[PDB]
């Protein structure tokens, strides 16, 4: 199966997230998050089968991540590199 | 691994400014949901109380995540 994403990539991504909230992860924890990332990705493909601005804001609201488009581009600001979140703001 | 590199990953498994922004926002969603899973794992680690977020905590986080979504 070609779907899996690497454990090292998850380590690099979550290292920055540890600073916002310090999660500490044993090895088999790393392996389980890597394994269940496949299930997460499939569930997301169910939840988001196609990409649109209204569709993605509605999906993320359904996910409980956000409450409105305001929260959505707040998330984009806190998750993207500087020029990009402005580029997305041009899209909204 | 960049957030736009996560967008590149989602592009590789999925298939120009509009689509660029769409895929960047999809990467934001994926990253946020990974963070949610890890945060719920930490929450489960609080219920058990030992040192670190042992794997069954991420597991339980995933079942709660699916049971609420």
């Amino acid at each position: 199966s070609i779907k899996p994403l690497q454990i090292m990539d998850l380590k690099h991504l979550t290292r920055q997230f540890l600073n916002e909230n310090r999660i500490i992860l044993p090895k088999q924890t790393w392996s389980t998050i890597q394994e269940e990332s496949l299930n997460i990705m499939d569930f997301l493909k169910q939840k988001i089968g196609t990409l649109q601005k209204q569709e993605l804001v509605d999906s993320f609201i359904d996910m409980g991540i956000i409450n409105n488009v305001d929260d959505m581009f707040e998330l984009a600001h806190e998750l993207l590199p500087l020029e990009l979140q402005s580029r997305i703001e041009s899209y909204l | 691994m960049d957030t736009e590199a996560l967008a590149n990953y989602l592009l590789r498994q999925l298939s120009s400014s509009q689509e660029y922004n769409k895929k960047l926002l999809l990467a934001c969603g994926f990253q946020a949901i990974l963070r949610k899973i890890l945060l719920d794992a930490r929450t489960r680690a609080t219920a058990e109380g030992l040192r670190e977020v042992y794997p069954y905590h991420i597991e339980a986080a995933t079942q709660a995540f699916l049971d609420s979504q």
């Binding site: 493909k45 169910q46 939840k47 988001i48 089968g49 196609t50 569709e55 509605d58 999906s59 359904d62 | 699916l66 049971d67 609420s68 979504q69």
Partner: peptide, 27 residues
């Protein structure tokens, strides 16, 4: 009767959990 899509629109809703949001149905 032949079209199975109309049947599935009812099957999936009872199939998957109610909290499993079927807001979007992939091709």
């Amino acid at each position: 009767p032949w079209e199975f899509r109309k049947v599935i629109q009812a099957e999936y809703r009872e199939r998957l959990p109610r909290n499993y949001e079927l807001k979007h149905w992939k091709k």
